[PDB]
Design a protein around this ligand. Structure first.
Ligand code: HEM
Ligand code: HEM
Ligand code: HEM
Ligand code: HEM
Ligand code: HEM
Ligand SMILES: CCCCCC[C@H]1C(=O)O[C@H](C)[C@H](NC(=O)c2cccc(NC=O)c2O)C(=O)O[C@@H](C)[C@@H]1OC(=O)C(C)C
Ligand SMILES: CCCCCC[C@H]1C(=O)O[C@H](C)[C@H](NC(=O)c2cccc(NC=O)c2O)C(=O)O[C@@H](C)[C@@H]1OC(=O)C(C)C
Ligand code: FES
Lengths: 49, 60, 241, 49, 378, 79, 378
């Protein structure tokens, strides 16, 4: 009965490199983290100034 | 050929060392280039400065 | 007298957001100050050195400073002589005692000029209008002695003589000293005599906008990231039976 | 303050019992043509114009 | 074992903004607590740098400030950030109290009350603040106000001269105010912590007034970053003033030194006292005017005794929601009138706004509450 | 003070969530954003707006009558 | 239920001096913690009343103080209580640190360390304090000292002029110091609480260094009244000075205004820096002199790393007990030399006392400790 518990679909929120159920997410692992960290790196570079 | 962001993560963002090193190295060059472009933008939209006024008084 | 009028919007070269003052125009203005106002209007806060970066140059400032004679420090006998002019000291001029301003101009105080643009509502325009305003009294009316007429003035009964059109000059290179050209320049200088920081202020202001223009979006995208876990979270309620 | 003939008469005509602080004008001056006062408002000490 | 939890110091810091459970639910109206904090320190911080250059002494008072603005490297931004931060400290204080009523937060008695104590003190502080440059507004501002204690029966006179150091405002009064303007923000800062202490006892209220225990999130990520962004916004605003419109909220006549002989027919306290100003003079009484002025603020401490509704937030309360905005607009009215001369329209309307204020908080909102109960069948 | 683990009692609720590095920070920012703020604005205009226009009407009429009280004053004084 | 225990505020107060368990055992050497507290507030309190009359500005500095002493109702007692309380604050600070070493209290690292931070800050504060009246000692005192940072390689010059606001001591320097002399005691007061926070983590040490858990008494009665009596004694002393010998500990020449031209061959910092003064000049080096001056105080933070004994208090340690007093007397020596001109006997003896100081704390006491271990068979 706890085997009726499927995780609700998220395609509606997923980053595009991650939409495919047949694609390993390790490929976009670097790219995805890179981006968000670049975002904060720049940010902090901005506060720094 | 991976991605710019990917290659960027591996070589500099992964370790908090290089991550931080990158931003202190990246802040130095940013302060310089942003101050250039900025002041330039500030002058270009002006020109009643004391810059273009000097040409007249090199003497005394 | 109970009724009043307010100034228009003269399109100053420094009215726009990121707009510097006209340094050429600040120059002529100091001239208007020295030849005309300076013999009635104290300017206790500005100095010859303050002019150095702004309008004039090193040697030029020295020279203009030397064209007066101020009472320097006492000497050995407790003297207090006079000396050429430094750069150091300011423009403390017209009168010693404040009431001596009243003894000259009939019972009227020509207030400090460093003040001006920030001490009167409307700023430059009120001084611009008050100078180039000068008009003639219509019916009803009166006046005491020469309590001149001015519409852009509380009560309309000033004590200040209109020292505008007396065409004085030295607008180096060539500039017509008309009433209006003379008024814009005094004001433009008076703006700078009140808010010297004026141009830097706005230069930084540009960077402040330009910086926040990169930061606001960024420090906002950061908060999204972290809250996204919460924003797309899914609830299910599964009670027994 | 040097009061004119007109001002003296106007103060003498005022209805005294209607006043918040009842006082005749002639008991507030020694010479009717001269009123001498402390330039301080009894409410909060500002200067009356 | 995690030192972040057992170290006597960190505990406090863990409890303040790391592990403290907060509603997954709060919105922007909860930011003004950090903003007030930020305000308080930034104020303390620029304020201090001005003190390394300021003076006191009536002769040099005005002169020193100009000295700073013109001579002191960067003295201008510091001076203007201080003066503009002061206004921002009121915008937030105002917004904070606002958030509070709407959402019913005032049900935390001790916390609310410490906050009222926090209000009077920053008011008392900012008042002394503007007397310092020794401008026209500074002198009579410092006069029109202080006097009020002279309305107090039997001893009013004594006190007003005791706070003065003379028979008027001079020598004794500027140094006094500077010193008090220096020690107060520290004391406030303490009180703030006690405010915050009592707050941690219940945790935060939220937009629904319901109770978020069933859905708390860690202050870690969440509210730290939502406080940072927020603070950046507060910086944008403070900098917009300082760097583009330095005197927009400042009375141009606090320039031009003092003069116990003058008094420039106009004169009003800084914007943030206008609503209060309006109230006081909208009463033909020395005693009543000041009595009413006091009640105007001390009524906040009365609000909780007139909570009548069975719900806590106004989130689901249209009737009260209407009276809330009527209150805000009406305060915006008092602010506007306060800013005008005591003449024709302006008198009677500011007189109506006053009555409204007190009748709204004392009769209207409490009744709106009961009717809503009755409508819901509660 | 109150810590997680000692807050309150919760029965049978599942909560699925996703890593931030796996989703977008701005899903349908404009697509779903605008419609919603319209919806929240609509939902509240009627309780927020009215008192403000009331002040607005009283502010413009108030200054009006202030000028027309003195300036307009004369008016007539004919003899 | 007893509200004295569950109310967020009282808790703190219950923990501070009501229910807190303390050794049935402590003696008078434990009073200086209250005395330092008292000192701190009384200092803050008279200090503030002087600020409502003081100025800054080099022209009026000296004039204002005399104004206070002569014109200000009671300004004299306030002024002298402030100046004398300042000395008392050192006598206690000194005694406190004394009590500490003897009894091994320093084993509470965090607490001891906060106390060192408390020492440097009140030193830094009191230094700025005496520059204020703008007397002769104030000027060169403010000069001889500050300069020292000019001994720091490569950047010394920059810093000393940055702390100065010019190229010498003037305008920029008096206002600066006043402001810092104002904000420091508040900051100290905070640090004190953290000092006290860490102290409550272990409770108090006692004359035997053993451990009193087996015999604790409530702070209630006991140490509250033994603190009151104590404070009365501190009042007797402070008042004895103020009311009978106001300038006994004060350099008579801080009277007579400043003068960058003069310098009166004598000049020494206030008594409480004499031992330090002696050390610095007992070294023919700009760098070494100041380096040694620093170590002279920063060595306290070194003491715990040289605890060598198997017992905690020196109560049962004759050998160390002797080296302790040799330290005190030797400090009394440095104080005396510091007070004398750099001439014949005085040089070589103050040079010996310095070496002694460092050799005693760094080699002698640590060895005395080990020998005692060996004697006991430990
Ligand atoms: C371009 C040079 C001058 C400028 C810009 C100037 C500008 C001003 C301004 C802005 C005021 C105060 C206006 C106000 O209260 O709103 C004033 C007051 C006055 N100044 Fe001038 N003025 C100048 C030259 C003079 C001269 C030459 C005299 C000598 C006749 C003079 C004597 C006065 C007097 C008597 C007043 C008092 C007006 C009053 O308050 O009743 N000023 N001036
Ligand atoms: C020194 C000025 C003040 C500071 C620094 C301050 C700081 C804070 C902080 C950090 C919070 C938590 C974050 C938040 O809810 O926004 C808060 C909440 C609160 N404050 Fe203040 N505040 C100050 C003035 C006030 C005022 C004026 C009041 C009301 C008279 C007040 C009563 C409250 C209440 C009742 C809460 C609870 C809010 C809630 O739970 O939703 N405090 N304050
Ligand atoms: C204890 C830290 C503070 C210090 C050291 C400080 C010191 C000063 C000094 C020396 C001045 C005169 C210089 C000037 O006017 O620019 C001043 C002005 C002022 N500060 Fe503070 N103050 C502090 C905290 C505050 C606080 C908490 C407030 C309230 C927001 C405040 C609001 C003001 C105001 C209103 C003025 C006068 C307004 C004006 O500049 O035109 N300051 N302060
Ligand atoms: C702001 C100045 C200081 C204040 C207000 C202060 C306050 C106190 C108080 C109230 C106590 C407990 C009562 C007592 O044992 O006497 C204490 C104990 C202590 N303090 Fe301080 N103190 C100050 C400076 C110092 C200094 C200079 C040191 C050493 C550098 C220090 C390190 C200690 C230690 C180690 C104890 C524990 C004493 C024991 O357990 O026997 N504190 N202090
Ligand atoms: C924040 C509270 C304090 C304030 C407001 C304050 C303010 C002042 C002022 C205005 C003076 C100059 C008037 C005079 O010399 O009598 C002064 C002198 C002094 N105070 Fe403070 N101070 C405070 C705390 C302290 C502290 C913590 C100490 C260190 C025990 C201290 C020790 C001194 C000293 C040494 C002097 C100069 C010595 C002398 O009077 O001859 N005061 N203080
Ligand atoms: C020195 C900086 C370290 C912070 C420690 C002191 C500061 C402190 O205690 O930090 C936390 C952050 C404290 N609460 C909040 O901010 C806070 C609480 C609920 C929700 C939100 N936001 C959005 O929902 C909040 O932002 C808060 O913001 O109070 C400040 C007034 C206090 O500041 C003070 O005391 C002053 C007396 C220092
Ligand atoms: C305002 C007065 C209420 C007291 C609360 C603050 C004061 C406080 O915390 O009180 C208790 C009394 C605290 N400890 C002791 O006195 C104490 C402890 C062990 C033994 C003895 N005596 C004899 O064996 C003691 O006397 C102590 O004395 O610390 C003061 C420095 C502190 O004072 C401070 O913080 C200042 C920062 C205020
Ligand atoms: S009417 Fe209130 S102070 Fe004059």
């Amino acid at each position: 009965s706890h085997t009726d518990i499927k995780v609700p679909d998220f395609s509606d929120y997923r980053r595009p490199e991650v939409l495919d159920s047949t694609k390993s997410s390790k490929e976009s692992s670097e790219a995805r983290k890179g981006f968000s960290y670049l975002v904060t790196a720049t940010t902090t570079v901005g506060v720094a100034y | 050929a991976p991605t710019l962001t990917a290659r960027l993560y591996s070589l500099l963002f992964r370790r908090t060392s290089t991550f931080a090193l990158t931003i202190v190295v990246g802040a130095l060059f940013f302060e310089r280039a942003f101050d250039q472009g900025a002041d330039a933008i500030y002058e270009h939209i002006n020109e009643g400065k004391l810059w273009k006024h000097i040409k007249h008084k090199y003497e005394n | 007298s109970d009724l009043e009028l307010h100034p228009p919007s003269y399109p100053w070269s420094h009215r726009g957001l990121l707009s510097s003052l006209d340094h050429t125009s600040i120059r002529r203005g100091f001239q208007v100050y020295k030849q005309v106002c300076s013999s009635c209007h104290s300017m206790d806060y500005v100095a010859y050195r303050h002019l150095v970066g702004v309008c004039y140059t090193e040697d030029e400032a020295k020279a203009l400073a030397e064209e007066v004679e101020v009472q320097d420090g006492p000497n050995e006998d407790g003297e207090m002589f006079m000396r050429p002019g430094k750069l150091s000291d300011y423009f403390p001029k017209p009168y010693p005692n404040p009431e001596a301003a009243r003894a000259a101009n009939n019972g009227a105080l020509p207030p400090d000029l460093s003040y001006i643009v920030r001490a009167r509502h409307g700023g430059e325009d009120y001084v611009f209008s008050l100078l180039t305003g000068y008009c003639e009294p219509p019916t009803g009316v009166s006046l005491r002695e020469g309590l001149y007429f001015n519409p852009y003035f509380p009560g309309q009964a000033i004590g200040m003589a209109p020292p505008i059109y007396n065409e004085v000059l030295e607008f180096d290179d060539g500039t017509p000293a008309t009433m209006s050209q003379v008024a814009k320049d005094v004001c433009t200088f008076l703006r700078w005599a009140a808010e010297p920081e004026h141009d830097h202020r706005k230069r930084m202001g540009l960077k402040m906008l330009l910086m926040m223009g990169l930061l606001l979006p960024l420090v906002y995208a950061m908060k999204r990231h972290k809250w996204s876990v919460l924003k797309s979270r899914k609830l299910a309620y599964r009670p027994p039976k | 303050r040097h009061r004119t003939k007109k001002e003296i008469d106007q103060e003498a005509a005022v209805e005294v019992s209607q006043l918040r602080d009842p006082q005749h004008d002639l008991e507030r001056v020694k010479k009717p043509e001269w009123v001498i006062l402390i330039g301080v408002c009894t409410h909060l000490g500002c200067v009356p114009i | 074992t995690n030192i972040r939890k057992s170290h006597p110091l960190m505990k406090i810091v863990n409890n303040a903004f790391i592990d403290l459970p907060a509603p997954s639910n709060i919105s922007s109206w909860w930011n003004f607590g950090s903003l007030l904090g930020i305000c308080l320190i930034l104020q303390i911080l620029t304020g201090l740098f001005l003190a390394m250059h300021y003076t006191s002494d009536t002769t040099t008072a005005f002169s020193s400030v100009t000295h700073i603005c013109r001579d002191v490297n960067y003295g201008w931004i510091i001076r203007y950030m201080h003066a503009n931060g002061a206004s921002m400290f009121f915008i937030c204080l105002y917004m904070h109290v606002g958030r509070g009523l709407y959402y019913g937060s005032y049900t935390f008695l001790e916390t609310w009350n410490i906050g009222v104590i926090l209000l009077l003190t920053v008011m008392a502080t900012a008042f002394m603040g503007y007397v310092l440059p020794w401008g026209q507004m500074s002198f009579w501002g410092a006069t029109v106000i202080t006097n009020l204690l002279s309305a107090i029966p039997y001893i009013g006179t004594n006190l007003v001269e005791w706070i003065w150091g003379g028979f008027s405002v001079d020598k004794a009064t500027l140094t006094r105010f500077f010193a008090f303007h220096f020690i107060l923000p520290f004391i406030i800062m303490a009180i703030a912590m006690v405010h915050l202490l009592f707050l941690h006892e219940t945790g935060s209220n939220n937009p629904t007034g319901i109770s978020s225990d069933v859905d708390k999130i860690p202050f870690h990520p969440y509210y730290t970053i939502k406080d940072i962004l927020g603070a950046l916004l507060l910086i944008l605003a403070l900098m917009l003033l300082v760097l583009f419109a330095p005197d927009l909220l400042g009375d141009p006549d606090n320039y031009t030194p003092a003069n116990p002989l003058n008094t420039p027919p106009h004169i009003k306290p800084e914007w943030y006292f206008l609503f209060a100003y309006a109230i006081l003079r909208s009463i033909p009484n020395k005693l009543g005017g000041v009595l009413a002025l006091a009640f105007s603020i001390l009524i906040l401490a009365l609000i909780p005794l007139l909570h009548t509704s069975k719900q806590r937030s106004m989130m689901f309360r249209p009737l009260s929601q209407c009276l809330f905005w009527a209150l805000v607009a009406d305060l915006l009215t008092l602010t506007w009138i306060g800013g005008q001369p005591v003449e024709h329209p302006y008198i009677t309307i500011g007189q109506l706004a006053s009555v409204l204020y007190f009748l709204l908080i004392l009769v209207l909102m409490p009744t709106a509450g009961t009717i809503e109960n009755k409508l819901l069948k509660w | 003070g109150r810590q997680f683990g000692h807050l309150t009692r919760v029965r049978h609720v599942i909560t699925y969530s996703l890593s931030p590095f796996e989703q977008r920070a701005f899903p349908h920012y404009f697509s779903k954003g605008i419609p919603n703020v319209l919806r929240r604005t609509r939902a509240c205009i009627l309780r927020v707006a009215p008192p403000f226009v009331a002040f607005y009407l009283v502010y413009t009429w108030g200054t009006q009558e202030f000028e027309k009280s003195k300036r307009k004053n004369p008016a007539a004084y004919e003899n």
